[PDB]
Amino acid sequence: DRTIASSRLRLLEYSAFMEVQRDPDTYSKHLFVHIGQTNPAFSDPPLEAVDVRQIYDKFPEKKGGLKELYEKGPPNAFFLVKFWADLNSTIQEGPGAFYGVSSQYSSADSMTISVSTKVCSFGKQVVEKVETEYARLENGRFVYRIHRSPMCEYMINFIHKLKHLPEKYMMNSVLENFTILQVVTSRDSQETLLVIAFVFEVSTSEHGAQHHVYKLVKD
Numbered sequence: 384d385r386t387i388a389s390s391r392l393r394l395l396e397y398s399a400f401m402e403v404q405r406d407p408d409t410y411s412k413h414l415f416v417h418i419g420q421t422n423p424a425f426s427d428p429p430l431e432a433v434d435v436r437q438i439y440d441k442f443p444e445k446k447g448g449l450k451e452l453y454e455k456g457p458p459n460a461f462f463l464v465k466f467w468a469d470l471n472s473t474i475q476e477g478p479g480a481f482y483g484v485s486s487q488y489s490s491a492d493s494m495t496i497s498v499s500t501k502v503c504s505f506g507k508q509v510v511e512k513v514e515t516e517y518a519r520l521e522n523g524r525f526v527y528r529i530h531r532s533p534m535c536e537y538m539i540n541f542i543h544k545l546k547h548l549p550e551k552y553m554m555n556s557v558l559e560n561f562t563i564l565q566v567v568t569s570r571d572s573q574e575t576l577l578v579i580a581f582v583f584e585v586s587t588s589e590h591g592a593q594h595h596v597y598k599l600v601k602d
């Protein structure tokens with residue numbers, strides 16, 4: 384319903400960021416990509432559909448691939464998010480900056496979730512992070528909170544090197560074959576709860592971070 388939500392699990396917030404301490408009291412944070420928790424409005428239009436077959440090649444296609452997952456279903460769990468990344472940090476990144484991802488999910492059931500994040504280049508897996516997160520009772524729902532999960536070294540290098548490129552159009556040519564695949568499962572059952580394909584593009588004209596959601600369909 385304009386929400387990146389499975390019948391079982393909803394992604395409430397997603398942030399990848401860099402934090403620097405300017406002085407003992409003062410911290411500065413820059414967000415590269417963001418998804419902020421918004422409540423669905425009755426007046427909002429349904430998410431557009433993107434055929435899952437069209438993006439198979441951008442993610443690995445092997446067991447544990449997007450096709451096999453989509454075959455296992457549930458098909459209402461799979462979404463696509465297109466990020467416009469704010470690369471104009473405008474802060475002095477310095478030895479000692481923290482590079483992290485913070486996110487929040489929500490559920491009507493309590494479970495132990497497991498979060499697979501697969502970085503991918505030309506459709507090939509470069510890195511997999513696996514995180515376990517636990518249910519916490521909030522107002523009328525269970526919520527899962529990942530605070531400041533550290534970025535892996537590959538991505539820190541990728542961000543800096545990317546930033547170093549003279550021109551935004553070259554950042555976009557690189558990002559065309561850069562993708563991340565997120566697969567949340569219930570840990571002990573391994574049932575698929577939420578799958579999000581992440582595609583990226585720099586913000587040519589910078590208004591800061593932007594994003595767009597799409598429902599992956601197999602019609």
Ligand SMILES: C[C@@H](F)C(=O)N1CCc2ccc(-c3ccc(C(F)(F)F)cc3)cc2C1
Nearest residue numbers: 399415468469470484500512534535538542
């Ligand atoms: C452990 C491993 F999961 C990891 O390190 N991750 C996973 C989650 C994630 C999702 C997006 C970005 C990101 C994408 C584009 C840009 C830029 F704007 F620069 F293009 C900057 C950051 C970085 C990460 C970090």
